[PDB]
Ligand binder design. Sequence first.
Ligand SMILES: O=C(CP(=O)(O)O)O[C@@H]1[C@@H](OP(=O)(O)O)[C@H](OP(=O)(O)O)[C@H](OP(=O)(O)O)[C@H](OP(=O)(O)O)[C@H]1OP(=O)(O)O
Ligand SMILES: Nc1ncnc2c1ncn2[C@@H]1O[C@H](COP(=O)(O)OP(=O)(O)NP(=O)(O)O)[C@@H](O)[C@H]1O
Ligand SMILES: [Mg+2]
Ligand SMILES: [Mg+2]
Ligand SMILES: [Mg+2]
Ligand SMILES: [Mg+2]
Length: 325
Amino acid sequence: RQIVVGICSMAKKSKSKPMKEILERISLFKYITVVVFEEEVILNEPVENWPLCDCLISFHSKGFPLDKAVAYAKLRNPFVINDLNMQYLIQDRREVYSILQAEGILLPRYAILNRDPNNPKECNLIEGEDHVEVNGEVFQKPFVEKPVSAEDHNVYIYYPTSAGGGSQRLFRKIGSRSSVYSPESNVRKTGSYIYEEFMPTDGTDVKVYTVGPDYAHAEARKSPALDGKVERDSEGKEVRYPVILNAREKLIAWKVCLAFKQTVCGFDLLRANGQSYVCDVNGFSFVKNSMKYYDDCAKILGNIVMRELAPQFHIPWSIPLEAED
Ligand SMILES: O=C(CP(=O)(O)O)O[C@@H]1[C@@H](OP(=O)(O)O)[C@H](OP(=O)(O)O)[C@H](OP(=O)(O)O)[C@H](OP(=O)(O)O)[C@H]1OP(=O)(O)O
Ligand SMILES: Nc1ncnc2c1ncn2[C@@H]1O[C@H](COP(=O)(O)OP(=O)(O)NP(=O)(O)O)[C@@H](O)[C@H]1O
Ligand SMILES: [Mg+2]
Ligand SMILES: [Mg+2]
Ligand SMILES: [Mg+2]
Ligand SMILES: [Mg+2]
């Protein structure tokens, strides 16, 4: 019989252009059949009724029942490409930074302010005009304030008096904008936040996309922290700049991929002070608008599948050579 690769995610994701491009390519593997789980089934049917697969590619996004995906994997025991339990932790920035620290990965100096919604002022924060103190730890402006939920993209940056004060409020892109300036100089007074040192970059963020630990595509984009106008090309796509990762950064990608057990993994790097700091780990993420990535990603995932399962299915398989970039 064919090896079945099951795709389990919200329709918005499973039906996206990158997914469709990759799935048609994986389907070219002679011994692999692709089955995309319908959203109505994922949301409404018990896991006992979900289709069978031998290899499961499943990932959480807004609205996805991760509890069900976990239960399905427990029931059927398929080969899992992106670890499901780690996807709970990826939703919590505190858990993400904790794992990065444990792996010896450079990240901005940070402190967590956990606030009890019942006693919002009993928390360990002291505010000055040009600094905050979080559990005793001082952060001079400029500093970054992030919601503990990784799914809340309302990240704020606070500027020093020497720069005009105020704050930059970041958010999920709306049309042509990704952030806006506010005259507000005081930090948010409700919610729990991570406070971290602002890393001076050249004005771009490096986005890294892994396919297993030995492949990473990188590209750069204007930092939303800069002014908030999104740069677009003549076709309306966000402008992307070429990046090649150095040896240190290739090791970062290897470490992130394995530490979070996400074969397909996106994360963000800040090139600052001669080093590269991880500021965000997003989990499952494809490169968009790159035919070469489509080819490479599909080939690598197909090969991972065959490597793991070909012996079980008595299929001859000789492990092939793959790109790293
Ligand atoms: O903003 C956009 C619109 P686009 O810029 O014109 O594509 O697309 C964004 C998606 O928004 P939704 O289209 O509503 O799902 C978002 O999904 P979410 O987190 O569930 O909101 C992520 O996509 P993914 O799941 O990781 O692949 C972002 O990638 P990231 O995690 O590296 O930041 C995308 O940004 P990038 O495309 O510019 O890289
Ligand atoms: N410590 C820092 N120093 C300097 N810039 C930062 C820092 N942290 C975040 N930024 C900038 O602010 C942006 C948003 O922060 P990030 O932690 O990526 O939030 P997010 O909401 O998870 N974005 P996404 O990549 O869509 O999930 C980053 O792309 C950086 O440009
Ligand atoms: Mg096939
Ligand atoms: Mg980010
Ligand atoms: Mg993120
Ligand atoms: Mg995501």
